[PDB]
Amino acid sequence: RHDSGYEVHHQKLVFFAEDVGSNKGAIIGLMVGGVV
Amino acid sequence: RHDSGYEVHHQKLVFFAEDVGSNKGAIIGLMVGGVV
Amino acid sequence: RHDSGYEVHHQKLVFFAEDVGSNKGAIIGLMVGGVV
Amino acid sequence: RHDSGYEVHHQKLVFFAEDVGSNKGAIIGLMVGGVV
Amino acid sequence: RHDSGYEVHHQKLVFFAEDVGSNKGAIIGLMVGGVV
């Protein structure tokens, strides 16, 4: 038996980020995996 | 038996970040894995 | 038996960061694994 | 029996950071594993 | 029996940092394993 009240089994998140363009400026409060 | 009140079994996060462009400036409050 | 109140079994985080572009300046408050 | 109130079994974090570009300046408040 | 109030079993952190680019200046408040 498991008897869980709150449960989450599997969550898969895949992020692909590629940047070829140049001359770009940014201001980010909090950046996880994105490309600037 | 497990008897858990709150539980999370598996969570997979994959981040791919590539940067080829140049001449880019940024200001980041908190950066985890992203490319600048 | 396990009898846990709060529990987290497995969490996998994968970060890939590559930087080929040049001439880039940044200011980061807190950087974990990202490339500048 | 385990009888844990708060528990975390396994958490895996993988960070890959590569930098080929040049001429880049940064200011980091706190850097863990990222490349500048 | 274990009877733990707060517990953390295993946490694995892997950091890969490589730097090929040149001419880069940085100011770091606190650096753990990152490359400058």
Numbering used by the authors:
A (entry chain E), B (entry chain D), C (entry chain C), D (entry chain B), E (entry chain A): 5 to 40
Which text from the study accompanies this structure?
The major pathological hallmark of AD is the accumulation and deposition of amyloid-beta (Aβ) peptides (amyloid plaques) outside neurons, followed by the formation of intra-neuronal tangles of the protein Tau, the loss of synaptic function, neuronal death, and irreversible damage of the brain tissue. We investigated Aβ40 fibrils formed from this monomeric Aβ40 in the presence of negatively charged liposomes composed of 1,2-dimyristoyl-sn-glycero-3-phosphoglycerol (DMPG) by magic-angle sample spinning NMR spectroscopy and cryo-EM. Here we present the cryo-electron microscopy (cryo-EM) structures of six lipidic Aβ40 fibrils that assemble from three filament folds, providing structural insights into fibril–lipid interactions. Indeed, the three lipidic Aβ folds are identical in the central β-strand formed by residues Q15 to A21, with only minor differences in the sidechain rotamers, but they differ in the conformation of the N- and C-termini.
L2 and L3 fibrils each consist of a single protofilament and reveal two alternative lipid-induced protofilament folds. While all 40 amino acids were successfully modeled into the cryo-EM map of the L3 fibril, the N-terminal residues of the L2 fibril are not well resolved, suggesting a higher degree of flexibility in this region. The cross-sections again reveal lipid densities at the fibril surfaces in the neighborhood of hydrophobic residues. In particular, the C-terminus adopts a curled, shell-like conformation in both L2 and L3 fibrils, stabilized by interactions between D23 and K28, as well as by hydrophobic intra-subunit interactions. However, intra-protofilament interactions between Y10 and Q15 in the L3 fibril result in a compact conformation with two consecutive 90° bends of the protein backbone. The absence of this interaction results in a more extended conformation in the L2 fibril. Conversely, L2 and L3 structures consist of only one molecule per layer.
